[PDB]
Symmetry: D2
Subunit: 287 residues, 4 copies
């Protein structure tokens, strides 16, 4: 009782963020969605029009427990970072308090302190280009939004979290082994994310008694996965054929693991990269 | 509601085997203990005398549900491997059906098929010697009882397990990084165990849809630990002083993680080495 | 014969860049220094005043073979990236062709194609702050100069390198394990550098038959090492006391390894992170 | 000028042992071969008949300098370990002083102290069986001859080695990632070998200032390789098709790296697993 989780990085019901929300709901955790402004209105519309009613179904008729839905952009740390153009952009103009600091303050004011935080986002302008051809701007854009965002989320949210709270993010094996197609510096961003998870585990553990881990998920055909041009269909096919466990990897498979890591049951685990990919990562040569 | 777990390697209530049994009990899992013959009667004596009553208490009105307790020696695969020096041994003479295959048949004959298996045993005759001074006989003894026993357990128990069953063992970071007092080939045995966990994950996964993982636990002042050369006293002191999470590591901390890995909740995790050590493994230079 | 190496990241004779240059000279490799503009003039002055004559001594009277010394700033990819302020800054005003593209073109025009490239630089404005307190700007600054610079160096220099050429950079273990004190996102930058080394190994290997590896060096009291405030004295003391090899780590120790990796003798090694740290990285618990 | 290397594990000129001998010869290192008794006479026969003359050619007017060739069985530590089944064996009856301790004393008695040691042997009676179906006897046989033999070699040879000496062994990536046809416990043996290399690095480093590393080599169609179950044909085909460097891996490619690790040039490297496989180990999803 009293478990509140903020999930940053939800634009629909086809990604891991939604799978994580469903499993947490089964444990009676209250959910707060952090939605990227560019897709905020479209998300709300569909929600209002009851387009997600089926996907919100859990257990036996059990409906998901969505406490709130807030506009959120991990590119901005404070209101002072918002550039004039973005502030005046059509999709941002009518929204407020969407920077990392503002959302933390908003959540604290409305619901008090929370104990669960999920970083389920990533972005790279040049993801379609191989690392060698990625520009400096594209590279830094990937690191800024996909990696630094985690650090910033921690810096502002630790002030509104209870001791013994837990934090998780999502990564991918391309950080440790070569996956052609995963460009734009996304591999670089994930490698940084995994390393930052260890350093943050040290600081957050000693000073706040807070835990942080990352889940290296297998392939899922999410909206963003298609942006890589297809790459995702190949990855899924390869996984279902060569993984030690030949079964379809579901968003809820990652969700149940996320639920465990966020609960007090994983009290002694921190700074780890946990693989939830049907064991594919352990293979060397296929069959 | 129908889950049965065989825990191989319990001689008292101060080790990880007991902690795992306690946590699985909270989930209403029926427990069967595999006890090393040399200490079987003494264990039985204490149990009867109520020396473990307090250690069996769980939650409010809940007691640990121990289905059965059987003599079990991981040194012998089948009845044919029992030598006269053992058969004629005082402690073994009074016991029967304690080889790996016999225990599997006995359990199956009495309770049917099971779906959870825990390997929580290690043994090395020359653990007090550094690797360089360990004899061939001592080295092989460690690998035989601490590593091969996992493979043999799987070979014989898969026949009495249900599909989608799960298996776990315990390892230690000395397999990956140097820990001076961890001798006799125990470091070697743990390295083989972690690698074997991957290979078995592939075979058991493809052929039976069965999962297998290993938990790399932090220091716990248990019975066997005290045999290493005080060493455990150092390890614990160091862990509690430098680990990112400054809290005492409890056998049940490993238990709750084991319980999760043995349930369907971790359906997509296999062949992994999961660290449950308060994050100590991530540190390099002590602060 | 005909071996030319460009070493990017030399501001004096106290770092690894100089140690790498000395060892390469022993193999009769022609050296070209890439010097950061802010310290370019001071470097030349000392050189001219013969302040480095002693340090240039190799073998028996054998003097180093410095082919050229060029101003170089890894922050700029092309002349178009140079901001008006920097272009007009006192130390840059009188220098030309110091961007990555210009230096590559300059080298090609003056000496033709080369076959050896060394990335021996790093920088982070907020290195004195722990990761949690590093600003977005500081973080991206670290990644831009310490990691992306490697990718850019490769993109422009592969056009002026012969097939079978070799490239190396320098990293540090803080990317894999926690080292308190290594802040400003330097740990993040090194993790990215190591991951990018693997991805680049794939692209450069398949398309140009060029190799790339990185050396994870132990502590050396270089000029930059002092910028971390001391941290470096502690690291050196810890290393000389706990490493399996209790000896002083010299810049030339890294130099000789760099020489091997850059030569044709390491033909089958690529995408690797090679540790040259007296074996400290393999230790878990000290003595 | 005074370097002597003992290479344990040579039965012909198609393996890595020969490639290592060739490269060390270019450096004028005196070579002593340790030959498995069962094939000692045949080897000697071919040598006398000049069947290896072409394989011994190096550079222009340079021939491989083989100091001596001795029968050597890594299964026996001392004369006391020789059983009647072996002593009475036809192939062993005619030979003497072939245990590890005897060879060390014999070499020392004839040529004095040495400074280079190479462990290039592996053996597993049930290599054709997958791990799950490998017997205890077969599993232990693999660990005894392929892993413990390294420890015993160090224990007995340090007495006849000079300070600052170097040692290397060969391993394979199947210890870290799953390779289906690599059975009989060879994967287990390699995992132990790599871990043991770290522990030994600590002991030999602190006590004798002696270094030890292991080379993880790529596929090479050798004599023993052909015993795995064609498998080697697959491995080679896969390596040459997907590795970042599309070139044939030669025994001398491993030889040049071995030569470097055995020289003073690598003075600061110890306890490491160095990959010499054209970078194949860094790949995840084949392109
Ligand atoms: N889908 C997969 O196959 C897969 C594999 C490994 C890891 N994960 C990781 O899981 C996370 C989500 O992946 P997914 O596939 O479910 O994607 P989605 O399902 O695309 O989720 C990503 C979310 O990020 C949001 N987002 C983008 N930029 C943002 C910004 N600046 N501020 C705030 N939100 C922003 C998007 O609007 C979107 O809802 C990422 O970290 C991804 O790398 C996914
Ligand atoms: N104690 C720790 O700090 C620690 C750290 C890492 C991993 N674990 C691992 O957990 C397992 C148990 O450790 P523990 O500390 O709880 O020890 P215990 O508490 O000593 O548990 C080991 C059990 O093995 C049994 N055993 C020994 N030889 C046997 C044989 N031939 N057949 C059957 N059973 C046999 C013993 O009787 C004992 O009950 C081991 O694998 C150990 O390496 C423990
Ligand atoms: N010294 C150590 O203990 C140590 C340990 C591990 C790795 N290495 C790595 O070796 C490299 C050099 O380290 P070092 O200690 O010898 O340092 P130095 O000896 O400080 O070398 C770094 C060089 O980078 C140059 N530089 C900084 N910003 C630049 C820019 N924008 N463009 C071009 N040049 C720039 C400096 O002027 C300097 O000459 C770095 O990558 C460092 O992280 C060093
Ligand atoms: N062949 C490859 O592709 C490959 C890949 C990775 C690592 N390496 C490793 O290199 C080493 C040699 O491999 P290789 O392919 O050159 O094989 P060979 O070319 O088969 O070399 C192995 C040698 O071990 C000797 N041997 C076997 N049992 C022995 C015993 N009891 N005592 C003494 N010598 C004994 C054999 O007679 C033989 O000369 C092994 O450790 C192997 O695992 C080889
Ligand atoms: O990390 C991922 C891994 C896979 Cl296999 C599929 C999708 C992934 O997620 C992303 C990839 C690129 C961008 Cl730009 C944004 C996101 Cl969310
Ligand atoms: O693996 C372990 C790690 C630690 Cl820190 C403490 C105890 C451990 O467990 C053992 C060590 C040696 C032997 Cl002979 C038997 C066991 Cl059960
Ligand atoms: O990587 C390093 C590791 C160590 Cl132990 C010492 C110095 C290092 O190098 C740097 C650290 C911070 C900045 Cl800003 C620049 C450089 Cl060159
Ligand atoms: O380790 C190896 C790896 C590969 Cl790919 C090919 C051959 C190898 O070497 C062996 C394998 C099994 C046995 Cl019984 C003996 C040896 Cl020498």
């Amino acid at each position: 009782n009293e478990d509140i989780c903020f999930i940053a990085g939800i634009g629909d019901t086809n990604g891991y963020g939604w799978g994580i929300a469903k499993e947490l709901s089964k444990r009676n955790v209250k959910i707060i969605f952090g939605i990227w402004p560019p897709v905020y209105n479209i998300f709300m519309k569909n929600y209002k029009n009851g387009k997600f009613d089926n996907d919100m179904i859990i257990d036996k008729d059990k409906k998901m427990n969505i406490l709130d839905m807030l506009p959120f952009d991990a590119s901005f740390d404070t209101a002072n970072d918002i550039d004039e153009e973005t502030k005046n952009n059509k999709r941002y103009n009518m929204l407020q308090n969407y920077t990392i600091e503002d959302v933390a303050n908003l959540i604290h004011q409305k619901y008090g302190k929370i104990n669960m935080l999920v970083h389920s986002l990533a972005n790279a302008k040049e993801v379609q280009k191989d690392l060698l051809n990625t520009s400096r701007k594209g590279y830094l854009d990937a690191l800024s939004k996909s990696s630094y965002s985690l650090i910033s989320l921690c810096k502002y949210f630790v002030n509104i979290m209870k001791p013994q709270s837990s934090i998780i993010s999502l990564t991918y094996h391309a950080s440790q082994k070569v996956v052609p197609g995963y460009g734009g510096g996304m591999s670089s961003a994930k490698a940084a994310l995994e390393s930052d998870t260890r350093v943050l585990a040290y600081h957050l553990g000693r000073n706040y008694n807070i835990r942080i881990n990352t889940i290296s998920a297998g392939p899922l055909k999410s909206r963003a996965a298609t942006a890589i041009n297809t790459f995702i269909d190949y990855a899924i096919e390869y996984s279902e054929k060569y993984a030690p466990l030949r079964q379809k990897l579901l968003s809820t498979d990652i969700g149940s693991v996320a639920s465990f890591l966020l609960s007090r049951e994983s009290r002694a685990i921190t700074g780890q990269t946990i693989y939830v990919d049907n064991g594919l990562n352990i293979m060397f040569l296929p069959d």
